[PDB]
Write a protein that binds this ligand. Structure first.
Ligand code: NAD
Ligand code: NAD
Lengths: 293, 9, 293, 9
């Protein structure tokens, strides 16, 4: 189905680099970091490569954690490998290659904990397991017959609070909103609200109060708070704790789950679901990510 | 998508 | 690389929307905001359109601030217009069109103060002057024969402090670093440092102290501070004010300009310029942007 | 490049 993703990135972008290019990565490649390379294959090209390197020495040649090497002779392919102490390890070749001479491309390399995940032109292309710890990578190299228009790095970052957004599509049965974050180590309470944007009514007010371990829910209708609902089996939050809160819109009620566990249900008071079109989030957390489908 | 803990729903 | 750009974005992205699509923009389209649409033109297509609308009414039909309408019959073209009170205004047509049947595209729409600026496939395409105040746009519609893989909104955001980055290429004669920010209304002082990353020497320590109106410079070498240089014609900062600080690396000295005006020179003490490879920024400002070429 | 105040250098 269709889904929305919302987040903050620190971005570091290099326009029009000259090839061959040897550049220092602006920061460490922690899991979740993207590298985005945009370019074009010249008509006369046989190959080019992108190398994630440990330094830029040439003699002895810098270790290459990730050598990503599209080739064009024959039917084409992408060669991948790692160079350690001037020795190439075992070679991993992918034959479903999207690269073509005289065609533009976008490479997206996601740096995961255990591997690199690479997509070209919006479609998945290959995985590549780490052989060198990714934390040892501080240099990017691009060599061969290729034009590069930009090289971009994307680093994850905490979203600014208070957070306030219109959803692209309103609530309704089967709609789902996910809030990913981290409770402050110093935290007292935080709030997640679903509003009717126009009337400023709050259909669902989610309010974990860590100081007293109470998960409070309410609605703000006709310009006044209603009866609070606090009934809970256990309090699923703690300071310093990562959390995934899922809010599912059912016909009769919202259902909320914290970390994969169903935590509470809340009967709809504001029943025009398709008028619930705004999300607000604030308080003592680090907001990491918001998803809705 | 991107859920360490799954989804009950 | 030719120019580096560094910033923070709030990003809001919709994957795989179904066409026709009518969605609420997550937030207001202030100048600087980007709308990024990735898609594909089906083989049988005659046209499609992206409409920036004021609401989604159908009778009467919602005003369309920006109607962006690629057509494929004949040579092809892009039609732009505005719909106000169900009247189409004067029609603006661009004939240098990058769209083709059976080809993928990326549309980038930049929302400027007085116009939209549109690029397709990384190349500039057209401008379109506002006819409706862009602040009245709250809805995006996509209609016609087209496949849309994503719709992305980029909103600008303050970079997180402290900021610390390696430059992709080191200092040297003719290198330039630009810091864009806003001094806090609260502000007492802030710092901008260029370091030799490996030794943690600070080649240039820029330190405007607003409370006492002194622009302080020093170097931190052999693990100690040197003689401060404070000489200036005037203090070019004030609380709450926007500033552009340009650090130019010359052969004998750094030169620093604040808001387009030359402010000071600093003779190199750490003379291995190609070892100056790290930028650090911290203190009482809102960091907007870092550029370097 | 997005300099409001220009560049003396
Ligand atoms: N800059 C250098 O250090 C250097 C050194 C030698 C060659 N080159 C040339 O520069 C371009 C890129 O060189 P590179 O070393 O970065 O990548 P290169 O990819 O083309 O070689 C790396 C790959 O070669 C494979 N390989 C190892 N033994 C082989 C054999 N007997 N036959 C075929 N393949 C074998 C490795 O497994 C690895 O996957 C070339 O076309 C190459 O000939 C460069
Ligand atoms: N309300 C609607 O949704 C509506 C209404 C009429 C037609 N349509 C159809 O839906 C698709 C898209 O419709 P749309 O209206 O959003 O875009 P539509 O662009 O194709 O029309 C908008 C443009 O048509 C121009 N135009 C062309 N010939 C004209 C003429 N002879 N007189 C006056 N204006 C002329 C207008 O100047 C304006 O730039 C079409 O293929 C169109 O035929 C839709």
């Amino acid at each position: 189905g269709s889904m929305m993703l919302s987040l903050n990135n620190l971005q570091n972008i290099i326009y029009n680099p000259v090839i061959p290019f040897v550049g220092t990565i602006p920061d460490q490649l922690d899991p979740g970091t993207l590298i985005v390379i945009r370019g074009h294959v010249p008509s006369d090209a046989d190959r080019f490569q992108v190398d994630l390197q440990n330094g830029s020495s040439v003699k002895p040649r810098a270790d290459v954690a990730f050598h990503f090497n599209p080739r064009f002779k024959r039917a084409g392919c992408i060669v991948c490998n790692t160079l350690i102490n001037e020795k190439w390890g075992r070679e991993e070749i992918t034959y479903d290659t999207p690269f073509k001479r005289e065609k533009s491309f976008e490479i997206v390399i996601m740096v995961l904990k255990d591997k690199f995940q690479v997509a070209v032109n919006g479609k998945h292309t290959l995985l590549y397991g780490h052989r060198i710890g990714p934390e040892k990578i501080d240099t990017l190299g691009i060599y061969g017959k290729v034009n590069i228009h930009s090289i971009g790095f994307s680093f994850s970052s905490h979203m600014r609070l208070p957070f306030a957004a219109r959803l692209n599509t309103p609530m309704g049965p089967g709609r789902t909103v996910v809030v990913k974050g981290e409770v402050n180590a110093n935290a007292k309470s935080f709030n997640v609200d679903l509003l009717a944007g126009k009337s400023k009514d709050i259909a669902l007010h989610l309010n974990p109060r860590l100081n007293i371990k109470a998960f409070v829910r309410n609605s703000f209708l006709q310009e006044s708070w209603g009866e609070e609902e606090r009934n809970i089996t256990s309090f699923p939050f703690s300071p310093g704790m990562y959390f995934e809160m899922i809010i599912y819109c059912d016909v009769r009620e919202f259902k909320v789950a914290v970390n994969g566990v169903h935590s509470l249900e809340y009967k709809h008071r504001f029943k025009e679901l398709s008028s619930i079109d705004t999300l607000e989030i604030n308080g003592d957390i680090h907001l990491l990510e918001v998803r809705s489908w | 998508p991107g859920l360490a803990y799954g989804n009950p729903y």
